[PDB]
Amino acid sequence: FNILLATDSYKVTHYKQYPPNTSKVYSYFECREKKKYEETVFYGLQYILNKYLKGKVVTKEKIQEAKDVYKEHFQDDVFNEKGWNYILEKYDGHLPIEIKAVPEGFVIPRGNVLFTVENTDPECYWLTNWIETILVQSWYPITVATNSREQKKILAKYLLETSGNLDGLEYKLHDFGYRGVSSQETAGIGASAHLVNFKGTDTVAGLALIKKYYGTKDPVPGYSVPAAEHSTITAWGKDHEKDAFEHIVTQFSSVPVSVVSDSYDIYNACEKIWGEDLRHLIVSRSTQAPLIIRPDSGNPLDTVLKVLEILGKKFPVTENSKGYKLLPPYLRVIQGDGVDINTLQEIVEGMKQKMWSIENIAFGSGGGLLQKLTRDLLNCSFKCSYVVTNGLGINVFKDPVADPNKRSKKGRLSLHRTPAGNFVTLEEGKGDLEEYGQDLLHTVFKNGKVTKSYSFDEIRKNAQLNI
Amino acid sequence: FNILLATDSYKVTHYKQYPPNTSKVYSYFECREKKKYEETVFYGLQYILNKYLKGKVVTKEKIQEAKDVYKEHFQDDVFNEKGWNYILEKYDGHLPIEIKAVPEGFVIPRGNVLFTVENTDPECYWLTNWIETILVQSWYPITVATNSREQKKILAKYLLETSGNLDGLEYKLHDFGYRGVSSQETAGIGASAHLVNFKGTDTVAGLALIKKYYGTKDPVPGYSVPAAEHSTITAWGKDHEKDAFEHIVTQFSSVPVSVVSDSYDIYNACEKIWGEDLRHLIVSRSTQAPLIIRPDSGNPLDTVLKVLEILGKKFPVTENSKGYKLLPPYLRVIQGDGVDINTLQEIVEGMKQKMWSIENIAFGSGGGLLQKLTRDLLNCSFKCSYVVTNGLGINVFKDPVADPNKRSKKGRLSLHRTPAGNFVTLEEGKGDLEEYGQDLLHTVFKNGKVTKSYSFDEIRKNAQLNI
Ligand SMILES: C[C@@H]1CC(=O)N(C)N=C1c1ccc(NC(=O)N2Cc3cccnc3C2)cc1
Ligand SMILES: C[C@@H]1CC(=O)N(C)N=C1c1ccc(NC(=O)N2Cc3cccnc3C2)cc1
């Protein structure tokens, strides 16, 4: 990795575009508010600080590599060799940068400063926005963690209404999205952002990232159970679906086992194969080792409601304290196809209307959880708010005529507790008046060293639901 | 990187789920047909073969790391230590796998075999689908390359109608999506997939991936020009937008320069600042070094049409051979906000309706180009089609009752030229009859060695538009 090749091309030319005699460029990141995701989980910055920004990031070889590449890329010699050499010689290749950030796991309303960046050496005014591209990728873990947590709110609300408790809440949305993300690296980041809110994952890459960059008291942050795919059923031949089911549940008789049942006909599998032919292998299983039946095709709501109606008539169904129907403890369902925040809400409301407890079901989400997200969802944005030119500080901003929603904040920023216990961002250095107590941002990075870190345990505690 | 921790958790348990006495598992990847992306660019497999699959991928330390992690992850000892040890001892940690693939750059209609995977050792039946997760991530570079190319078709069609040529087509869609993707790795893969079709990029990460894994005769596969951001304008102070514009165009007087002009009022910037105050610096510029005015806010179509109307009345507009209006060669426009395949089509059709040539404009796309894409768009899918159990080959498939569109192909597959010059996938080993030509799939991977490679130059040639 070469930080000199880890920015937008145009930023290579920016050191020649600022006003001459500029000693300071001070920039900030926010989840810009709109005209519905009203609060965001801050998670991911620490990963980036440690992997890409900290220590000796500049060498004589990296400056040369970059000079050679940009000479051909621009068909011109615009690369700032002198500026990068200054960093190598003065600070042994350590970035003269101060980053202040909200603590990780913190749940902040839209339109508040989450972190600030500035240069600590007047020579390195250009460096602040060089690293915009790297720092803005914070959007991804922030967004995954926020959208995961909003899904937990929906599951929590319906599990409480239909069961009267939150038992198993942290295992009800399982990460299926390893194959569905753009890269191995994305898989690690995304799975880690999900585990802020839940404990169930099949995206193994997430575990090593958490261990290396955050840490947990427990040996692993995430857990899984044995489960079939279409290959492990269909390999037996079309006329031997029963022989496949029997072999799989018998191999995993004393642990929970998920078996995809839609290879040929989901409704036949539930009613005839599970419901009659193999009934005797299901009803004998322990409460700690249920069969979990997995549909994976058709309208998600309609398929879940019909599978439950089928199983309710073949197995001894009970009625819980609140009047909702419950399968026996050895039998559960998981819907692992077409699950996003929208269809999740559709299914649990649909199940509630037909008097089925949410105790009965868990969800698998892949693309909906880790891939079908953009920087646009929470308006994740990095902008310059304050510069010092000719020894004079100026409050700086954009305010486009045709979009007031893209207006940026002015001057040096500070995050404060209101008297009612909410958050406010003070602009124009007004935090120095100390009318709102102390700044809630901490220095997390300074002059190539990480100065403050959080365990994955702390982050989980900060990210807890109200209830 | 540890390939033993680079799969879906549930696949760790699959070696116990296949029929006993299974010596072969043969699986295939396709872009499944629907009930409108009719043809896909095959690109990305080679990257994955070299980075993750080739050579000694298994060590005594990696088997132990995996055994320790999975023991805690499952709260059970399910990990196949024996199977992974066999690969270490017999093949010096080299994967006993054969992968056949269509050549990279190839444009194939939906629902055709793109690559096949199988084990070369009867012991390693389980290995074929272990690597599904890693191989299926091919969806991302395939999808980016396909969607980029469809956008090139739209640009090509309207540039021809309005100008009568394709001059500068390969520079008209510029990659802005470095900050908008989920990771550094994704940035590299995505930018590389775009450069299959175009030569303009700001996602620098793409250049090193191409050089390392593919190669070009040319020194670099992608190019860029100097450009401003809001920071390099707004840093001058609200009342000095003119002083900023003048400084920037003067610094980059002999090369093309992009200047974002919407910081406060885009319409004022075009009509008064560019159109009157600084007119004398624009009209003096060379045809090889134009000013490119950049709006970045408001309705994309409406803003482009109004900026052009403004500039058409302040600058000497010509009428080309085909009756469409053309700015002087020293003045061009780029729309770099809210550009996806849909809005791209909206704008060029809108410009055509108002008799503006597509010569006038180029596009910047970030999230639309590299992030706002899923595995669902082209139905990228990996399925088992053929097994050998008890020495007997079986043709295998899924066929869900409630979704015929998820039906998979049967038996050993082969890709052929039809007599009319189209593609067909033969099922059930029917390719072994010589009734069609040669199989177009070539062995690209066998027993830990990459056996066939393509230059980025070859891939570009294969991916060309007809015309
Ligand atoms: C163990 C949890 C808890 C629970 O209460 N229920 C009902 N279900 C659980 C569960 C059910 C199923 C799985 N795993 C799966 O079905 N997988 C794993 C997986 C990964 C990627 C693509 N497809 C699949 C199929 C994982 C956990
Ligand atoms: C030079 C190309 C070719 C051409 O014909 N036109 C009209 N425009 C071109 C061009 C126009 C603009 C740029 N670059 C930019 O405006 N950038 C670069 C960039 C990257 C990420 C986010 N924002 C920006 C702003 C690069 C190339």
Which residues on adjacent β-strands are paired with residue A39?
A109
Residue B202 token pair: 């700001």
Residue B130 token pair: 């272990």
**Gap from A161 CA to chain B (nearest CA, Å):** 31
Nearest ligand, measured from the Cα of B202: 2
User: How would you classify residue B338: left for phi > 0, otherwise alpha for psi between -120 and 50, otherwise beta?
Assistant: left
| Burial per residue of B299-317, b for 16 or more beta-carbon CB atoms within 10 angstroms, e otherwise | ebbebbbbbbebbbebbeb
CA distance A194 to A143: 10
List phi, psi (to 5°) of B66: -65, -45
| Burial per residue of B353-377, b for 16 or more beta-carbon CB atoms within 10 angstroms, e otherwise | eeebbbbbbbbbbbbbbbbbbbbbb
Which residues on adjacent β-strands are paired with residue A175?
A201, A365
Does the beta-carbon distance from B185 to A183 stay under 8 Å? yes
3-state secondary structure of B182: coil
3-state secondary structure of B391: coil
CA distance A122 to A308: 67
The percent of chain B in helix, strand and coil, each rounded to the nearest 5, is: 40, 20, 40
CB atoms within 10 A of CB A404: 10
Residue of the nearest CA to atom 8 in ligand 1? A362
Q: How would you classify the pairing of strands A414-417 and B97-101?
A: unpaired
Q: How far is CA B380 from CA B29, B111, B115, B128, B137, in A?
A: 7, 10, 12, 17, 9
CA distance B325 to B335: 18
CA distance B403 to B407: 8
**Gap from A248 CA to chain B (nearest CA, Å):** 6
B285 is in an annotated binding site: no
DSSP label of B49: I
CA distance B139 to B148: 14
**Gap from A285 CA to chain B (nearest CA, Å):** 17
Minimum-distance ligand 2 atom for the alpha carbon of B332: 7
CA distance A265 to B406: 12
List phi, psi (to 5°) of B353: -65, -30
Nearest ligand, measured from the Cα of B334: 2
Does the beta-carbon distance from B265 to A401 stay under 8 Å? yes
Helices B184-194 + A184-194 axis angle, to 10: 140
Determine the straight-line distance between the first and last CA of chain A, rounded to whole angstroms: 44
DSSP label of B435: T
A437 burial via Cβ count (<10 Å: 0-12, 13-18, 19+) = exposed
Residue of the nearest CA to atom 3 in ligand 1? A171
Length of chain A: 467
CA distance A79 to A255: 60
Minimum-distance ligand 1 atom for the alpha carbon of B10: 18
Q: Is the CB of B8 under 6 A from ligand 1?
A: yes
Ligand 2 shell residues, CB under 6 Å: A 8, 10; B 168, 171, 174, 176, 200, 202, 224-225, 227, 256, 258, 292, 294, 332, 334, 336, 362, 364
3-state secondary structure chain A: CCHHHCCEHHHHHHHHCCCCCEEEEEEEEEECCCCCCCEEECCCHHHHHHHHHCCCCCCHHHHHHHHHHHHHHCCCCCCCHHHHHHHHHHHCCCCCEEEEECCCCCEEECCCEEEEEEECCHHHCCHHHHCHHHHHCCHHHHHHHHHHHHHHHHHHHHHHHHHCCCCCHHHCEEECCCCCCCCHHHHHHHHHHHCCCCCEECECHHHHHHHHHCCCCCCCCCECCCECCHHHHHCCCHHHHHHHHHHHHHHCCCCCEEEECCCCCHHHHHHHHHHHHCHHHHCCCCCCCCEEEECCCCCHHHHHHHHHHHHHHHCCCEECCCCCEECCCCEEEEECCCCCHHHHHHHHHHHHHCCECHHHEEEEECHHHHCCCCCCCCCEEEEEEEEEECCEEEECCCCCCCCHHHCCCCCCCEEEECCCCCEEEECCCHHHHCCCCCCCCEEEEECCEECCCCCHHHHHHHCCCCC
Place of tokens 């008209």: B172
Question: Residue A357's Cα: distance from chain center in Å?
Answer: 28
Candidates A186, A144, A1, A372; CA nearest to B133 is A186
Q: Quick one: closest CA in A to B203, which residue?
A: A8
CA distance B138 to B143: 9
CA distance A125 to B288: 31
Q: How far is CA B351 from CA B161, B306, B314, B356, B420, in A?
A: 12, 10, 18, 5, 38
Residue A220 token pair: 């692993």
Length of chain B: 467
Q: Is the CB of A294 under 6 A from ligand 1?
A: yes
B294 is in an annotated binding site: yes
Q: How would you classify the pairing of strands A113-119 and A97-101?
A: antiparallel
CA distance A32 to B162: 39
Minimum-distance ligand 1 atom for the alpha carbon of A256: 1
Does the beta-carbon distance from A400 to B5 stay under 8 Å? no
Residue B288 token pair: 């090889």
CA distance A276 to A259: 16
Q: Is the CB of A171 under 6 A from ligand 1?
A: yes
CA distance A131 to A136: 9
- Please answer whether residues A260 and A296 qualify as being in contact, where contact means their C-beta atoms are separated by less than 8 angstroms: yes
CA distance B149 to B194: 8
Place of tokens 């989920």: B182
Residues of B in contact with A339 (CB under 8 A): none
| Burial per residue of A215-250, b for 16 or more beta-carbon CB atoms within 10 angstroms, e otherwise | ebeeebbbbbbbbbbbbbbbbbbeebbeebbebbbe
DSSP label of B3: G
Does the beta-carbon distance from A297 to B258 stay under 8 Å? no
3-state secondary structure of B209: helix
Candidates A6, A19, A2; CA nearest to A384 is A19
**Gap from B340 CA to chain A (nearest CA, Å):** 13
Residue A466 token pair: 């109200």
DSSP label of B123: G
Q: How far is CA B227 from CA A38, A50, A260, B101, B260, in A?
A: 34, 30, 53, 41, 8
Alpha-carbon dihedral sign for residues B226, B227, B231, B233: positive
Residues of A in contact with B226 (CB under 8 A): 10, 13, 74, 78
CA distance B319 to B324: 5
Residue B300 token pair: 């994309």
Minimum-distance ligand 2 atom for the alpha carbon of B361: 7
* Experiment type: X-ray
CA of A174 to the centre of ligand 1 (A): 6
Does the beta-carbon distance from B176 to A17 stay under 8 Å? no
Candidates A129, A133, A15, A21; CA nearest to A83 is A15
Q: Radius of gyration (Cα) for chain A, nearest Å?
A: 27
3-state secondary structure of B223: strand
Residues of A in contact with B399 (CB under 8 A): 263-264
- The identity of residue A377, as a single letter, is L
Residue B250 token pair: 């003067």
Torsion of CA B445, B45, B188, A203, to 10 degrees: -100
Q: Is the CB of A252 under 6 A from ligand 1?
A: no
List phi, psi (to 5°) of B52: -125, -35
CA distance B423 to A67: 46
Candidates B197, B168, B199; CA nearest to B332 is B168
Q: How far is CA B231 from CA A15, A25, A266, A383, B91, in A?
A: 11, 9, 57, 7, 56
B432 is in an annotated binding site: no
- Please answer whether residues B235 and A18 qualify as being in contact, where contact means their C-beta atoms are separated by less than 8 angstroms: yes
Does the beta-carbon distance from B230 to A408 stay under 8 Å? yes
The set of residues, in sequence order, having a beta carbon less than 8 Å from that of B309 and lying 6+ positions away, is: B354
> Which of B183, B213, B340 best probes binding to A when mutated, by most A CB atoms within 10 angstroms?
B183
Minimum-distance ligand 2 atom for the alpha carbon of B177: 21
Q: How far is CA B375 from CA A298, A299, A445, in A?
A: 18, 19, 37
With the most atoms of ligand 1 within 8 angstroms of its CB, the residue from A163, A172, A174, A260 to mutate is A174
3-state secondary structure of B150: helix
Q: Is the CB of A156 under 6 A from ligand 1?
A: no
- The identity of residue A366, as a single letter, is G
List phi, psi (to 5°) of B31: -100, 85
CA distance B307 to B271: 9
DSSP label of B53: I
- Please answer whether residues A179 and A370 qualify as being in contact, where contact means their C-beta atoms are separated by less than 8 angstroms: no
Q: How far is CA A286 from CA A166, A294, A334, A393, in A?
A: 21, 19, 18, 69
Does the beta-carbon distance from B202 to A8 stay under 8 Å? yes
Nearest ligand, measured from the Cα of A201: 1
Nearest ligand, measured from the Cα of B167: 2
Which residues on adjacent β-strands are paired with residue A259?
A293
With the most atoms of ligand 1 within 8 angstroms of its CB, the residue from B7, B10, B17, B133 to mutate is B10
Q: What is the CA angle A364-A369-A370, rounded to 5?
A: 125
Torsion of CA A214, A215, A217, A221, to 10 degrees: 90
- The identity of residue B98, as a single letter, is E
Place of tokens 């490119």: B292
Torsion of CA B331, B332, B338, B344, to 10 degrees: 150
Residues of B in contact with A367 (CB under 8 A): 374-376
Place of tokens 């910047």: B364
Q: Is the CB of A409 under 6 A from ligand 1?
A: no
The structure was resolved to a resolution in Å of: 2.4
CA distance A44 to A376: 17
CA of B194 to the centre of ligand 2 (A): 15
3-state secondary structure of B47: helix
CA distance B352 to B345: 11
CA of A332 to the centre of ligand 2 (A): 54
Residue B155 token pair: 């640009």
Kindly write down the DSSP assignment for every residue of B231-266, as one continuous string. Answer: HHHHTT-GGGHHHHHHHHHHHTSSS-EEEE--SS-H
